[PDB]
Amino acid sequence: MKYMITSKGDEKSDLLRLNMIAGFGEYDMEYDDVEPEIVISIGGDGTFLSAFHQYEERLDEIAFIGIHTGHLGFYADWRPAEADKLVKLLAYQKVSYPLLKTTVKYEATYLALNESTVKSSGGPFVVDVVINDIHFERFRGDGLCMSTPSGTTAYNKSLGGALMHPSIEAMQLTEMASINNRVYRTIGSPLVFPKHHVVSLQPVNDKDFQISVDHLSILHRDVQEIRYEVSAKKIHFARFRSFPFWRRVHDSFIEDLEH
Amino acid sequence: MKYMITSKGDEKSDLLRLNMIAGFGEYDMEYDDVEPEIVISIGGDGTFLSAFHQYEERLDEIAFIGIHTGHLGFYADWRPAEADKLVKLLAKGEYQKVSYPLLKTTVKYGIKKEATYLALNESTVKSSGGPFVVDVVINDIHFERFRGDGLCMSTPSGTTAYNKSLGGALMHPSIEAMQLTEMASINNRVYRTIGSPLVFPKHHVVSLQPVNDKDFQISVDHLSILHRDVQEIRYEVSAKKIHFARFRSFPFWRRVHDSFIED
Amino acid sequence: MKYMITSKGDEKSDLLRLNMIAGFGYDMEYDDVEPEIVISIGGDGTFLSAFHQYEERLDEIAFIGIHTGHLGFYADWRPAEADKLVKLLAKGEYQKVSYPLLKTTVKYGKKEATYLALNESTVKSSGGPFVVDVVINDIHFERFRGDGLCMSTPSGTTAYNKSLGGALMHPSIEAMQLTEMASINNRVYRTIGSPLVFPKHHVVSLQPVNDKDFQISVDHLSILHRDVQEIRYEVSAKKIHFARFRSFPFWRRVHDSFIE
Amino acid sequence: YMITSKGDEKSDLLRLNMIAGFGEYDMEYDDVEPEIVISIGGDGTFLSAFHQYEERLDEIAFIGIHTGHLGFYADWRPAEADKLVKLLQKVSYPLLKTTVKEATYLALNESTVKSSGGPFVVDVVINDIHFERFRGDGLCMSTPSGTTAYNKSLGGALMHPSIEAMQLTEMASINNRVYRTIGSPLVFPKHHVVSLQPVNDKDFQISVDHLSILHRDVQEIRYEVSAKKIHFARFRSFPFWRRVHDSFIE
Ligand SMILES: [N-]=[N+]=NC[C@H]1O[C@@H](n2c(SCC(=O)NCCc3cccc(Br)c3)nc3c(N)ncnc32)[C@H](O)[C@@H]1O
Ligand SMILES: [N-]=[N+]=NC[C@H]1O[C@@H](n2c(SCC(=O)NCCc3cccc(Br)c3)nc3c(N)ncnc32)[C@H](O)[C@@H]1O
Ligand SMILES: [N-]=[N+]=NC[C@H]1O[C@@H](n2c(SCC(=O)NCCc3cccc(Br)c3)nc3c(N)ncnc32)[C@H](O)[C@@H]1O
Ligand SMILES: [N-]=[N+]=NC[C@H]1O[C@@H](n2c(SCC(=O)NCCc3cccc(Br)c3)nc3c(N)ncnc32)[C@H](O)[C@@H]1O
């Protein structure tokens, strides 16, 4: 079938990449980096993110799989030692994760695998948080972070967000160093929104914001509204053994007694 | 239909109750506190909790409704002044029902039998004097070894209660999940915990297993009873749901906004 | 000089105790009534009991702690060093290090009771919601509603205070730290959220709103005080004295406990 | 004496209103050797007045007027400008000395350090002893008076300015098995030095109050409580905690 492999750029990833293509050189597999059905990422989560955005137009036609050449990742969950076992077994069941739809208004749309953040471009960050066409709070601080379920283990976790299992179709809004005084009273707690819930970020003073989607920071000028909602689109993973989400959370933050 | 009303106990709630009973007494409504189809709580959220636990065996045949005689509650969403419009719409049967998820707490001893509990807000587990030390096993796999005050597993609707004060996230009740939060974790080299709140979906089981002490203080919606010789405490989203009678639209986030931001 | 030793209670501590006492058998006399050197064997909780056992002779006592289990913040010396400990103290070749303490004063409806804390002093309700007014230096600061409040010593910041999200303070700083316990921080009961660090001569007064019965704990000594009118917190003028031999930095001790 | 302005018309007019008063009591406007510096505007305006005279802090008593809201440095309302000139005890606050590797900086609020286009990974060395390996957004070392600013938003504690210390807070620490951090804010006394050492990237974005500068080839960033103190001119009694109350509690 049709496949392609991306690389982090270093020698370890390039070497493992070519060796797998050679491995694919022992089965009925065709290399296509234009119309693939299987995209293989080699490196880290950041590499996996780049592979996701490289083919965010064919997510319905692509099953992703990740190998971490460095530390254990949440998307790159396969070890380099299992590269032989991978080409054999793929030549399987599919697992789908939710995505975050980001809409900007001046309309531009973005898909997030991890999260979408909004900060100021040269002053204090002051916006109104509107939930389902109804005003909720006025935020002032560094910024706001709307995270995907799979992305809760990333920037979200560092910002004090909760960890949600990816089978839950939702989004999580977390504060970034919010000034919580008498003028700008915010909820403080992270907020988890279900499907069809729209979180609208509307400017108060400055209308130019620094918006990043999976760390794709672009400075949007003359912004009228930033809308957040659970995308109807989903990323598909190729599953072979059972590597539970909580196990990956455990091995990353608690301990990994066999490595 | 068959209905009943519970009261907070003060004059305002008792007075409103009798007036509503008289109101239903002008339609095809029968007062039945044994097999009701509509349970109306008058007072606060704590009052609503008592009404829920009073009828936890008939949740599938009961639509709850709450009236707050004091401050706005998350379960008590009706003002006393709308009791008249309430009786009219309940007698006509002009309402749709909305369901919230619940938390099943299972305790296991050295088999004496086995006890199960349902929570609307949350279920907490603490020590009976000394330090609280348990192993957190997620779906038959060890996750962490906890040492501290205790742990708190919350329902989606219960996230606005104890969960929020403990640093938990707020989840919309339409989401079928449960949320585990730490209660003063020591989080050191020996007892390393995740720190972050954990949100578990359906069919996920959180098993708490004792390390030294086997006596735990278990609370379900603030009903703390001392269980001795505990072998296992299991948490999972119950298949049972509490049903609410909806008339107008009072959004959860609006209820959160009005409660914590400003009103 | 005169010394005495306390034990955690288990065999490891009791055996290590007798072996050390046997070591002193130097010009050292065992006196548990008027001791000059107090040796704690077990854990920090054991050290706390030894501290409160002789809180009336703190000016004439240099404390030292041995952890038979994991490393503690007061019991910071390992059991393998029990021989070296007895030797160095018998010559009297050691300097003294002092840590600040927390004075807790309760006022009723009767007299007034005072307590000394090495770690912290906490106040919770004795049934139901905990609602008090936090008054700083005779001036109202906030109205708290939740589980309780915790006023911590500098050395005690590494204890309960840290689990509650409090900051860690170096014990050389003469101060106290107030932390919240599950505040319902809403529109009616708006709290500061942040931990508050108070200097000397600053008085934090906790005054009841409705319920007047509170659970007051001093270094985990919980007693039910009835008819409470006021709970006062301030840095005590008294200090706990440690026997220093080598250099075991506070931050190094924090590192070994939480980082490693 | 001398007077600084926020830049807007409100401050300039108010400045002129006070300056006319001083020509009747025996004080001459000197922006080279002032003994009393008057700030008109906000806390941010006060910061500029502080940084304008970091070489004469030992010979200057500061005073702030807020044309807007109650500030933590600007505690006088414009209506009390008249009472000021008549009276015009000293109160000293601790400061944060920041050393880059040699550049030295004084901070009134805080000093933060982040990366210049990637992950922020440094070794936190406390008194020549390794404490932790940090990975995240950055770190924030705050002065006692600055704890009510950026420090508070980062979850730091609020400490009374009479306490001579500094407070380190984390900025989005990943805190995993590899990069285990303390999580808790750390309050350091005098003579304690927190040394931040690079692991891979050596380019960092360092900010002092509000002077964000991109340092390349950084070998070490040292933090310690400065021996210098900022002196305030106090007339009435405005307790720090009431000021905290008025701002965040309401
Ligand atoms: N009251 N009542 N009803 C019981 C609910 O009260 C909520 N709750 C509990 S009960 C846990 C407990 O033993 N708290 C001791 C002090 C206290 C008791 C009751 C209410 C309050 Br407020 C405080 N504490 C909570 C808290 N600190 N913040 C916000 N919700 C809390 C729990 O989630 C229960 O569901
Ligand atoms: N045992 N003992 N030592 C008492 C000390 O234990 C420290 N401590 C307390 S005591 C408060 C309490 O009653 N907690 C209930 C469960 C518990 C009891 C005792 C130790 C522990 Br751990 C847990 N909780 C602490 C906590 N969660 N984290 C880190 N230090 C704590 C306090 O600072 C006391 O000074
Ligand atoms: N690679 N990469 N970057 C993409 C992911 O990095 C995650 N991430 C971001 S990106 C936000 C940012 O600009 N951070 C500046 C410092 C930094 C950048 C990238 C990684 C790290 Br670690 C630190 N910060 C994160 C954080 N502090 N903790 C744990 N994940 C973070 C985001 O969720 C992105 O998904
Ligand atoms: N000039 N000026 N501003 C600098 C002051 O702003 C205080 N401050 C900063 S600055 C951090 C930052 O880079 N924020 C994004 C752009 C920005 C510039 C100036 C002010 C603000 Br806000 C934001 N954030 C703060 C925060 N989140 N909470 C409370 N105080 C904050 C810092 O403590 C400085 O003292």
Strands B216-220 and B206-210: unpaired
- Same domain assignment for residues A132 and A11: no
State whether B187 and C258 contact (CB < 8 Å): yes
Interface of A with D in 67-126 (CB under 8 A): 71
Beta carbons of C181 and C164 less than 8 angstroms apart: yes
Q: Shortest CB distance from C136 goes to which of D130, D167, D241? A: D241
Radius of gyration of chain B, Cα coordinates, nearest whole angstrom: 20
Say which CATH number the domain at D81 has: 3.40.50.10330
B199 Cα–ligand 3 center, Å? 22
Ligand 4, pocket-test mutation among D141, D145, D148, D150, most atoms within 8 A of CB: D150
Q: Which amino acid is at B4?
A: M
- Same domain assignment for residues A10 and A76: yes
- Same domain assignment for residues A223 and A107: yes
B128 touches chain C (CB under 8 A): no
Ligand 4 pocket check for D110: Cβ under 6 Å: yes
- DSSP string covering C196-239: EEE-TT--EEEEESS---EEEEESS-EEEE-SEEEEEEEEEEEE
Residue B73 CA to residue A214 CA, distance in Å, equals 38
- Same domain assignment for residues B259 and B219: no
State which approach was used to obtain the coordinates: X-ray
Pocket, ligand 1, Cβ cutoff 6 A? B 46, 49, 121-122, 158, 161-162, 165, 221-222; C 125, 128-130, 145-147, 182, 184
Q: Which amino acid is at D215?
A: H
B257 Cα–ligand 4 center, Å? 26
D36 touches chain C (CB under 8 A): no
Nearest to D117 by CA among D101, D138, D102: D138
Give the number of the ligand closest to the Cα of residue B127.
2
C180 Cα–ligand 2 center, Å? 15
Burial class (CB in 10 A: 0-12, 13-18, 19+), D98: buried
Nearest to B153 by CA among B97, B220, B231, B61: B220
Gap from A3 CA to chain D (nearest CA, Å):
31
CA-based nearest residue in chain C for residue D148: C194
Half-sphere exposure of B8 (CA within 13 A, CB side): 19
D133 touches chain A (CB under 8 A): no
D44 is in an annotated binding site: yes
D238 touches chain C (CB under 8 A): no
Residue C199 CA to residue D174 CA, distance in Å, equals 33
Nearest to C209 by CA among C188, C185, C229: C229
Beta carbons of C37 and C64 less than 8 angstroms apart: yes
A144 Cα–ligand 3 center, Å? 14
In which domain, by residue range, is B130 found? 102-239
Burial class (CB in 10 A: 0-12, 13-18, 19+), D104: exposed
Ligand 3 pocket check for A46: Cβ under 6 Å: yes
Helix (H) or strand (E) holding C143: strand C139-146
Ligand 1, pocket-test mutation among B41, B160, B162, B178, most atoms within 8 A of CB: B162
- Same domain assignment for residues B137 and B53: no
Q: Quote the Cα angle for C110-C112-C115, to 5°.
A: 145
State whether A189 and B169 contact (CB < 8 Å): yes
Domain count, chain C: 2
Residue C164 CA to residue C168 CA, distance in Å, equals 11
Residue A194 CA to residue B250 CA, distance in Å, equals 17
Beta carbons of B202 and A168 less than 8 angstroms apart: no
C193 touches chain A (CB under 8 A): yes
Q: Name which residue sits closest to atom 10 of ligand 4, judged by CA.
A: D150
D151 is in an annotated binding site: yes
Chain centroid to CA C163: 15
Beta carbons of C84 and C114 less than 8 angstroms apart: no
Ligand 4 pocket check for D119: Cβ under 6 Å: no
D153 touches chain C (CB under 8 A): no
Write out chain D residues lying below 8 Å of A157, CB-based.
Answer: 174
Beta carbons of B114 and B137 less than 8 angstroms apart: no
Q: Name which residue sits closest to atom 32 of ligand 4, judged by CA.
A: D150
| Cα→Cα distances D206→A160, B52, C212, D104, D221, Å | 24, 56, 51, 12, 9
- Same domain assignment for residues D105 and D82: no
Q: Shortest CB distance from B194 goes to which of A168, A172, A254? A: A254
Ligand 4, pocket-test mutation among D210, D211, D213, D248, most atoms within 8 A of CB: D210
D141 Cα–ligand 4 center, Å? 14
Give the number of the ligand closest to the Cα of residue A216.
3
Which one of C31, C32, C44, C83 is the catalytic residue? C44
B174 touches chain A (CB under 8 A): yes
- Same domain assignment for residues C45 and C146: no
Gap from A154 CA to chain D (nearest CA, Å):
8
Beta carbons of B127 and B217 less than 8 angstroms apart: yes
Which residues, 6 or more positions from B100, have their beta carbon under 8 angstroms from its beta carbon?
A: B120, B155, B156, B157, B173, B241, B242, B244
Nearest to A245 by CA among A72, A69, A60, A8: A72
Q: Name which residue sits closest to atom 32 of ligand 1, judged by CA.
A: B162
Which residues, 6 or more positions from C154, have their beta carbon under 8 angstroms from its beta carbon?
A: C99, C100, C169, C170, C171, C172, C173, C174, C175, C176, C177
- Same domain assignment for residues A237 and A216: no
- Same domain assignment for residues D214 and D105: yes
B181 Cα–ligand 2 center, Å? 18
Write out chain A residues lying below 8 Å of D249, CB-based.
Answer: 182
Say which CATH number the domain at C196 has: 2.60.200.30
- Same domain assignment for residues D27 and D70: yes
Gap from B221 CA to chain A (nearest CA, Å):
21
Residue C37 CA to residue C3 CA, distance in Å, equals 5
Strands D166-171 and D186-188: antiparallel
B83-92 vs B11-24: helix crossing angle, rounded to 10: 30
Residue C148 CA to residue C138 CA, distance in Å, equals 20
Neighbours of C70 (CB within 10 A): 12
Beta carbons of D112 and D150 less than 8 angstroms apart: yes
Q: Quote the Cα angle for D72-D76-D80, to 5°.
A: 175
- DSSP string covering C67-120: ESSS--SSS-B-GGGHHHHHHHHHTT--EEEEEEEEEEEEEE---EEEEEESSE
Nearest to D130 by CA among B101, C259, C13: C259
Tokens 């934090």 sit on residue: C204
Which one of A28, A45, A206, A222 is the catalytic residue? A45
- The residue among A72, A142, A258 with the most chain D CBs within 10 A of its CB, best to mutate, is A142
Closest ligand 2 atom, residue C152 Cα: 33
Q: Shortest CB distance from A244 goes to which of B141, B172, B257? A: B141
> Is residue A124 classed as helix, strand or coil in its secondary structure?
coil
Residue D48 CA to residue D64 CA, distance in Å, equals 12
State whether D174 and A180 contact (CB < 8 Å): no
- Same domain assignment for residues C196 and C122: yes
Radius of gyration of chain A, Cα coordinates, nearest whole angstrom: 20
A83-90 vs A11-23: helix crossing angle, rounded to 10: 40
Give the number of the ligand closest to the Cα of residue C163.
2
- Same domain assignment for residues C202 and C244: no
Write out chain D residues lying below 8 Å of C199, CB-based.
Answer: 160, 162-163
Helix (H) or strand (E) holding D93: strand D90-100
D170 touches chain C (CB under 8 A): no
Residue B222 CA to residue D81 CA, distance in Å, equals 56
State whether B71 and C160 contact (CB < 8 Å): no
Residue D92 CA to residue D111 CA, distance in Å, equals 20
User: Which ranges of chain D would DSSP assign to H, the alpha helix?
Assistant: 9-22, 43-52, 81-87, 150-153, 240-244
Nearest to B152 by CA among B208, B211, B227, B215: B208
Beta carbons of B127 and B213 less than 8 angstroms apart: yes
Residue D1 CA to residue D13 CA, distance in Å, equals 18
Give the number of the ligand closest to the Cα of residue D173.
3
State whether D247 and A182 contact (CB < 8 Å): yes
Beta carbons of B215 and B150 less than 8 angstroms apart: no
- The residue among B171, B176, B236 with the most chain A CBs within 10 A of its CB, best to mutate, is B171
Structure tokens at D127: 């008194």
Ligand 3 pocket check for D137: Cβ under 6 Å: yes
Residue C22 CA to residue C16 CA, distance in Å, equals 10
Residue D120 CA to residue A170 CA, distance in Å, equals 29
Q: Which amino acid is at B38?
A: I
